[PDB]
Amino acid sequence: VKSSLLDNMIGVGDTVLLEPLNEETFIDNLKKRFDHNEIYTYIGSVVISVNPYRSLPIYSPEKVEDYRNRNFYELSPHIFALSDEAYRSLRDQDKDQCILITGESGAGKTEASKLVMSYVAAVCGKGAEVNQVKEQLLQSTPVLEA
């Protein structure tokens, strides 16, 4: 409760706080965040991801411990924080979840599937099973892509 995403915020971290509201300010928001290598931006509980076309170091297993079991509000925007909500709504509440990826090809949909399922492969407790189903899923992906 002592930390917030408002501290050390590049641009405006959440677009509900963006003022004034048009597309012109929002393009500048994603511009000034993408320049400072901040590619995640929320709308409410919505993750906006921007493809950087390189491997960013924000996916370390060290940062998995940082992103785990903090609140949605308490930390800088990242995609794992969505999966860290969804999984706990599956775990502590026993309610079925679904994670929807919307966009066009070449914007990072398959990467977002890989990173969501990678976080779930990290924190589930039996990681080799999720890696075993995962490896045949990502293996079966170019088959369907044909």
Partner 1 sequence: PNYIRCIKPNDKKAAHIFSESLVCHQIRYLGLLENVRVRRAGYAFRQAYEPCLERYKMLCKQTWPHWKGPARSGVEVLFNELEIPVEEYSFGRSKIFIRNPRTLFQLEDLRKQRLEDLATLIQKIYRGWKCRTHFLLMKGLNDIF
Partner 2 sequence: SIKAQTKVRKKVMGVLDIYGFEIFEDNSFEQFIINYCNEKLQQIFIELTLKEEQEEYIREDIEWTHIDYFNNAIICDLIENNTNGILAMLDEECLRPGTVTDETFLEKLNQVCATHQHFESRMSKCSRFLNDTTLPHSCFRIQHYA
Partner 3 sequence: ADQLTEEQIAEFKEAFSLFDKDGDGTITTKELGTVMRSLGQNPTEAELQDMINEVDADGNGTIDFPEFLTMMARKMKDTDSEEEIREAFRVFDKDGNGYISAAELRHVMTNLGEKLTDEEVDEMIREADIDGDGQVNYEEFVQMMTAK
Tell the smallest beta-carbon distance from residue 38 to partner 2 (Å): 23
120 binds, among partner 2, partner 3, partner 1, none (CB under 5 to 8 A by kind): partner 2
Nearest to partner 1 of 21, 138 (CB atom): 21
Residue 110 backbone class (left: φ over 0; alpha: ψ -120 to 50; beta: rest): alpha
Query: The dihedral of CA 67, 12, 28, 45: what is its sign?
Result: positive
Residues in CB range of 95: below 8 A, 6 or more apart: 89
Does 18 engage in binding with partner 2 (CB under 8 A)? no
Task: Please select the residue that binds partner 2; options are 5, 81, 117, 122, rule is CB under 8 A.
Answer: 117
Residues in CB range of 79: below 8 A, 6 or more apart: 40, 47, 49, 112, 115, 116
**Chain centroid offset of residue 31 CA:** 18
Tell the smallest beta-carbon distance from residue 86 to partner 2 (Å): 6
Lay out the site mask for partner 3 across 1-40 (x = CB under 8 A, - = otherwise). xxx-------------------------------------
Does 136 engage in binding with partner 3 (CB under 8 A)? no
For the record, the structure tokens of 101 come out as 């990826």
Does 24 engage in binding with partner 2 (CB under 8 A)? no
Binding site for partner 3 (CB under 8 A): 1-3
